[PDB]
Subunit: 204 residues, 4 copies
């Protein structure tokens, strides 16, 4: 499954139809994915993750910063399953950053991943090359399995497909739900599209 | 004064496999029409819209059972979230009614409790608008200070008598839907999403 | 037998929580934080399905005080049902109770026959109301009648009835909030709390 | 305020009165602080934070790993305020580890002239925050505040008190809500005390 497919001819939602951060009022164009829809999709993903990555000890890797929201909510939904049903597994967590100029900064020593079920949690897959690099590096420390859950996957001329996908989006730049534009819009609950005012206001 | 979130006749919905669904309704549903989380988001905005307009005086929130109960609880929860985090809040009392076509209200408090009060009527869906017009005609006999109507769903239909509610969640096609307290012969009320029933479902719960 | 709140529990200071602004002078202490109610209700929903999930459940809400507990209990029940391999469909109903007991509103009682009935209440005080309601329900031969009550009081006035599901066992004190009222007020409050003398005078009939 | 005070005699809550992670069934002793209680308290803290820090751009710093849950929940309640009020402020986020040496995170020059909120899971001796504060002040933020879910009552306290406190607890070892015992129990909803069995089970 490619996840929830949002087509190119999606107009999104008018800002005035939802509760939007006041300081971003004139900065956003449309709401592209409402927060509540992300939650419903993530709930289902949590059940698929446990069904696939059970029942050995899971190491959950959060790719900071954009992955932090999806990570926290996904784990919360996984927590809901483990405390309300039989058949569960203990989970440890770790948080990493990926550097360019490929380079894993932060997180524990990668030997912790050895012989374990590693769940990598991403915000978005664009070209897919970043995850290919990370998976190759991770694969050298020999785990039981390694899976990738990405909130977003872009339809675009690019290389990879994650094991768990929330939404398949058009080739547009989106912010919100921890996804950023120059560090901004992480403090936004919905996934949205920036306006021209916003891009110039928070330009680097 | 928005018509709410507009869902067009072209909207196909979502595959059931993309969401978590009641296991006992797996064969009884065709598509997810409005995800539960989308409802909450819209309902959150509606709560702020209601207080902007009705927060000036004491509110009597009137729930139209049974289909209205979920939208009533969630709306009030979001209104309460505002009232315990702002300097501007107003007391609220609640009451529940059931409308039987025999047109006639049933099992409520004395409607004199509406006199001089700001009444918020909460419904699940408005189709022709005849039911609400009737209810309002009865309510206005008791001279409320103000009477407003919040409806989760408003259908686009030529059968409409022209009545428009004050607060609208979603403007939907002229199609039968269930879930979120809306029912098909008392079934699907235990459904969290708003959905379209399958041929298998309507045959089993006929 | 549920979460026991002893007689000497002082509760919580008002300024430590988020409180309805129009009730700021009307409340004394927070007795049961909203989140605690949710946590306890979550477990109760699993206990309900463990005993009653084997057959079609008819859920009866006792208006008005039960409306919050009813909605939240069913939400957790639904959360279970959309994540399990097995579940049974639920139909809901809402009733009000009166004397001269007489069930006001709701469907025909014949809809309860052969079904697993869950009566959802806000509180059990003397228990006389539930004893009477249960005696009426039994007449229509349901498969099973169970009662979920959020609150049970430790009171000498208790006739001796205990519900099958209990959220909290509270002292013999008057509490408001979470759909529980004082002359129709405080239903618009998600914490179970203790009224102040200021509030008791302001809102008295 | 010292926050919600938990006494020394508080026995907590029986395990089978709540929904508990199935794999920690005999590893916990009692539920110390129910998750829902943490939420209500965190909600009030969010309002307190915004009233003191909402006058200017906020940079929220999460002290991984233990602070991650309190961080995400606190920021969510803050977001609820900001999308429902007529006045709010942009917030950027950052994640750090402490080994004073800051492990990971952006250049500390990003804190200059901004309202810095450091988010912790627990204050014990208070040494960790004091040294971090004395370092952060040297980058000249507009202000710097500290929110901690937990503050322990202990004679070896250097006397430091955070600006925002969730709960004041006795000198007991607690786990859950991202707090760990040898990297375990981070996948737990409530704050709890481990049993004798669990303590030996996950012995480092
Ligand atoms: N916030 C946001 N970021 C986007 C978007 N598209 C690509 N990116 C950058 C994606 C993430 O951000 C890059 C730098 P960062 O993680 O330090 O913020 C790139 O994915 C890696 P790959 O699969 O190899 O191309 C987007 O629509 N929104
Ligand atoms: N569950 C469901 N019910 C629908 C739908 N359309 C009309 N109805 C009947 C709804 C009410 O039917 C009466 C039975 P009830 O209120 O006891 O459930 C809407 O009425 C609105 P109006 O035409 O303006 O008087 C629908 O798509 N789903
Ligand atoms: N708000 C509130 N109501 C209380 C309380 N104790 C009894 N009641 C009234 C309870 C309800 O009686 C009438 C109130 P209602 O018509 O609003 O439901 C007593 O429970 C029934 P029983 O077991 O037969 O004694 C209390 O502490 N707070
Ligand atoms: N999980 C847990 N950790 C506890 C506890 N008490 C102190 N700690 C260690 C707290 C953190 O130290 C452990 C290192 P870590 O951040 O890598 O987990 C002490 O707070 C810092 P300070 O105020 O300067 O003394 C506890 O009850 N549970
Ligand atoms: Mg990323
Ligand atoms: Mg209706
Ligand atoms: Mg009652
Ligand atoms: Mg810490």
């Amino acid at each position: 499954s490619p996840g929830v497919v949002i087509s190119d001819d999606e107009p999104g939602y008018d800002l005035d139809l939802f509760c939007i951060p006041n300081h971003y009022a004139e900065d956003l164009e449309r709401v592209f994915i409402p927060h509540g829809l992300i939650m419903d999709r993530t709930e289902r993903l949590a059940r698929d993750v446990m069904k696939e990555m059970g029942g050995h000890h899971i190491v959950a890797l959060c790719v900071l910063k954009g992955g932090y929201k999806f990570f926290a909510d996904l784990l919360d939904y996984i927590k809901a399953l483990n405390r309300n049903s039989d058949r569960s597994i203990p989970m440890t967590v770790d948080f990493i950053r990926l550097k360019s100029y490929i380079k894993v900064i932060g997180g524990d020593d990668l030997s912790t991943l050895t012989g374990k079920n590693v769940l990598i949690v991403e915000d978005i897959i664009d070209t897919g090359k970043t995850m290919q690099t990370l998976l190759s590096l991770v694969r050298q420390y020999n785990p039981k399995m390694v899976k990738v859950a990405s909130l977003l996957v872009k339809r675009t001329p690019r290389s990879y497909k994650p094991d768990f996908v929330g939404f398949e989006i058009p080739d547009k730049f989106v912010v919100g739900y921890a996804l950023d534009y120059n560090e901004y819009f992480r403090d936004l609950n919905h996934v949205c599209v920036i306006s021209e005012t916003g891009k110039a206001k928070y330009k680097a």
